[PDB]
């Protein structure tokens with residue numbers, strides 16, 4: 001049974017993710033990047049070098065997410081092809097949910113808290129690169145307004161990964177059971193951690209579906225950039241993840 | 247999925 005599940009997931013989250021909400025919030029509340037000169041100090045065109053920078057972060061985060069997943073009880077017991085399917089389809093949903101933690105209305109943290117890049121500077125890049133961050137800010141503002149802490153987030157991120165309807169899953173039954181356990185423990189956790197917020201659970205569930213759509217739109221913009229910008233390759237790990245996605 | 251498999 002699942003009396004130790006929340007503890008394991010939360011501990012795995014704290015151990016594996018270099019950035020968390022407590023760290024991000026006390027740094028926010030860093031070298032400012034607000035123009036091209038500041039970009040170069042913190043650092044072969046501009047927009048293309050920012051695009052490349054997001055990939056690096058993604059690659060690192062996936063690296064962290066892989067370790068976090070292996071520590072989710074029952075996950076390492078799955079077929080290696082099922083573990084690939086899950087991370088492949090959950091990873092970007094997890095990235096943007098965790099990315100909310102480093103974002104305010106004015107910008108976001110970069111280079112491990114050492115940097116801050118402004119929302120306005122990002123909005124002011126040449127099309128279509130100016131379209132990359134803004135929807136994430138949009139999502140983050142509403143998500144951050146739910147006032148979740150890392151313990152809630154660990155369980156939320158685990159549920160994103162152990163998802164029984166990812167395409168091409170072999171053992172759907174076991175993974176549905178894994179998910180059932182996590183969602184259950186998450187429901188209980190939110191009730192005791194956020195007693196005044198009656199609808200928090202259903203609100204998170206809504207965020208899960210919002211993230212799916214956010215990722216779908218993001219993959220589309222990434223594909224547009226890939227095919228139409230000459231200086232815009234994708235890291236081979238990211239290319240694996242995006243392959244066959246639609 | 248060579249690299250994700252590699253991490254896994």
Ligand SMILES: CCO[C@@H](Cc1ccc(OCc2csc(-c3ccc(Cl)cc3)n2)cc1C)C(=O)O
Pocket residue numbers: 033039042043050051053054055057058059110111115117132136222238
């Ligand atoms: C297009 C790729 O997006 C990624 C996903 C992704 C990853 C990270 C991200 O934001 C973190 C960030 C933004 S600007 C920055 C920076 C700027 C300047 C310097 Cl000097 C250093 C760091 N770090 C936003 C996104 C959407 C992908 O498709 O894999």
